[PDB]
Amino acid sequence: KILPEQPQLELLSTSKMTRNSWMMLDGTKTDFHITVRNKSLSCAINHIKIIPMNNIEQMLKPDYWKKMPPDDLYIMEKQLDWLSKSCVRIIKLPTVIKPNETITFDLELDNTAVPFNFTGFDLLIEYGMSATDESCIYLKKLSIPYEVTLRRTIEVPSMDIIPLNELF
Amino acid sequence: TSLVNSKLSNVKFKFINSNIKVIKGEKFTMRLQIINSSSSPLDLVVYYNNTINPIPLTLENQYQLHNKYRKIAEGIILLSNDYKIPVVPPRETYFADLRFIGIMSGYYGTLSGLKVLDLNTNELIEVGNGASVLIQ
Amino acid sequence: TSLVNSKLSNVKFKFINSNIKVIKGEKFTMRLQIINSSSSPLDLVVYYNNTINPIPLTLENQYQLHNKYRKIAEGIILLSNDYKIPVVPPRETYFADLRFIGIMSGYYGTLSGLKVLDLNTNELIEVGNGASVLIQ
């Protein structure tokens, strides 16, 4: 089997990163630019899809709700869902890139709610060159990593209630 | 009685202003002066527990005891809970400056609850016996 | 050249904004990112020496060279000198946020003087090469 040509991406640069490393302050959100170029000289991709993907989503046993009550299940599962669907967000990504074109797209990394083992971030993309308008699209993979560090900040370790008893 | 000593150790505690009268809700400060001369430094931690202690008696005495415990528990509260006293080198003193606020008028003679535990042998010395707060 | 490495180790240094222009006399800041990945935490300390480095040649070269060291020594100051970078555990990054201020307008391309030294093997890694300050 002999296909048509397929293009390639290279991750030309990232704006506020150095060797794909950076820190948060455990609550502050930031954003930066990802610069990617289409190395091919003829083909043009008509599909891009970004899936953020993270260390905690990697490092869980796929069966983890056997020995767990609902109350403790709910909090972990809620924070897992939030971290999956909102920890890294994509804004104004491109739809088409011509051959030998470089494009910058913005990426917003926010962690207002992540546990203290989110040390790792493995954004993988998939870009697709359209076929000859017949059946399908030819997809591809690219799995650039990130080593994001998390620093401690203001934390509440306890409380009480002490109900009031009389006006002042 | 006003100056308290620690069991199985040498350290001594005294509040500088043992008797203090203030108004309801106004935060006030104490100075828990410390004498330490035993052998070596300590890392004792002072905290106030606002939890109703368990009663062990006729009801006329049980509810008396519970009223005492409840007033102790939710009368006065500490603005510096879990205040790790940093270091007390041997043959030296320290001023563990505490801060409070009261919410129930009354007389807390020899106030309990304010207890300090040492992270060397897990003491539970009742250092609060040297205070006579009166909040109106 | 903007990225600078360390000898006999794997720690790496870079300024988030290697190029910056600012009016003279306004205190500014440059975030020094310190990527540690080798084996163990560091206790490296940053410092800036405002000392005219002794000269080692005709007068035309000699005074050029002396003026270069003088400008380097007493052009810029660091408001957080002798900073103790607290801890940078292995395979992690730190932001040694520095604060400066200039007192002599010019172009301090690859500014010297600023050299962080590792307090683990007594290195003198010159991290100043990653900065290209221009004070008007």
Provide a descriptive summary of the structure in words:
The structure is cut from a larger assembly and holds one copy of chain A (168 residues) and two copies of chain B (136 residues). Chain A is α+β, with helices and mostly antiparallel strands. Chain A is 12% helix and 26% strand. Chain A is built from two helices and nine strands, in the order ββββααβββββ. In chain A, a hairpin with a 6-residue loop joins strand 7 and strand 8. By secondary structure, chain B is mainly β. In chain B, 12% of the residues lie in helices and 36% in strands. The chains are: A alpha+beta (168), B mainly beta (136). Chains in contact: A-B, A-C. At the A-B interface, loops of A face loops of B.
Number of strands of chain B: 11
The residue fraction in helices of chain A comes out at 10-25%
What is the overall shape of chain A? Answer: elongated
- Main structural class of chain A: alpha+beta
What quaternary form is this?
Answer: part of a larger assembly
Major sheet of chain B: order of its strands? Answer: 1-2-4-8-6
- Order of strands in the sheet with most strands of chain A: 1-3-6-5
Q: Please indicate the percent range of residues of chain B in DSSP E strands (runs of 2 or more).
A: 35-45%
What is the helix fraction of residues of chain B, given as a range?
10-25%
Q: How many strands appear in the DSSP assignment of chain A?
A: 9
Distance between the termini of chain B: 25 Å
Computed Rg of chain A: 22 Å
Can you summarize the main beta sheet of chain A?
Answer: 4 strands, antiparallel
Helices and strands of chain A, in N-to-C order? EEEEHHEEEEE
| N-C termini distance of chain A | 86 Å
Q: In one word, what is the shape of chain B?
A: globular
Strand content of chain A: 25-35%
Q: Order of SSEs of chain B, N→C?
A: EEEEEHEEEEEE
PDB class: protein transport
Keywords: complex, GTPase, Guanosine Exchange Factor, GEF, protein transport
Entry title: Structure of the yeast TRAPPII-Rab11/Ypt32 complex in the closed/open state (composite structure)
Chain A: Trafficking protein particle complex II-specific subunit 120
